[PDB]
Design a binder for this molecule. Structure first.
Ligand code: NA
Ligand code: NA
Lengths: 99, 90, 96, 97
DNA sequence: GACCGGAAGGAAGGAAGGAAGTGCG
DNA sequence: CGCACTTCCTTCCTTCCTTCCGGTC
């Protein structure tokens, strides 16, 4: 998170969301974990530039997001296009598991 | 694992498969001259014989973001291969 | 020898060996061609069999995809959750 | 050169002679090299050390333990792309206190 | 129906890293 | 024992689709 002091994708997003100077490509839509991609093409490019993977597009990025469904990090907001919600309870388990 | 674009240019070089696909100029502008037949071969080759143009076109409509090919705006079954896009992957 | 740690190929064969585990995974062919009827279950079982929580099919399948290069097993091109065990690789291993 | 051959040596042995470009060669005058056939490099390495089970996956692991030793680097993004750290091989042959 | 693209999911395989096991020295 | 790996996974992806649409053309 902001206490992750390689870069995971779910972190890369929170990094941008925190500084709302990057609101031109992505920002929040309701503070209850609900965020929305304003320029998915731009989001992918940055994540590409980061990983030295300039061919990286939403098409390939999207896949990586939808792997966080079984391992609960984030969720799909039904219908709402480009809308995903973070499972805070899920990341807490991942970051501090209780056997 | 052979890609889709590789499979297309397999049967465009050999014009003995002109019953399925052919050229409309050497400007990277080919023509899908038997969509139903075109769909069968990919499915048969991939062990996925349920493949139709509907699902196959989606695969070719993921080639827009990736500068590999595009559509001939309006014209039917007419897609333009990026010959400066294949050179990038050579 | 297979005394040190349980190998994944050995982990899967321990369940389909008999039944009662047929609900999540079982055989489909004499060659083998086993099929996972509930991969979500199989993942959890292997994830608790080795005491490794946060285990899914993706992480499991990746390990079974490394088995291609070694020639331990082969995948049935197209068929969903379909893999066939290769006698060649397992013969070379086993006790030696 | 400065000649149980170690792995980091085995690769540099091949890069010298331009006849081994088939499987591995240079890609820049900054110690950058690509494995043009990793499966081939593994086969030669499995024969050399006499470990015929050898692949790229296990070969690579050894090269990714070299990161901690500061022997070589991952050329980020580029496929099969690794680069030697000249600084962290002088430390091995001339460990200065 | 062609033709378009989001979204949910298989499937190959590179790359980073823990962890026990293997000789060799 | 200390080194230098080797063996075998987890882990997290990038990559190329297959499938299923709803929706415009
Ligand atoms: Na699932
Ligand atoms: Na690195």
């Amino acid at each position: 998170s902001r206490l992750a002091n390689q870069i995971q994708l779910w972190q890369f997003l929170l990094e941008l969301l925190s500084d709302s100077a990057n609101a031109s490509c992505i920002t929040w839509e309701g503070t209850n974990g609900e965020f929305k991609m304003t320029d998915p093409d731009e989001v992918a490019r940055r994540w590409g530039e980061r990983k030295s993977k300039p061919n990286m597009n939403y098409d390939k990025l999207s896949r990586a997001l939808r792997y966080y469904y079984d391992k609960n990090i984030m969720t799909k907001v039904h219908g709402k296009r480009y809308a995903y919600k973070f499972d805070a309870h899920g990341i807490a388990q991942a970051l501090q598991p209780h056997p």
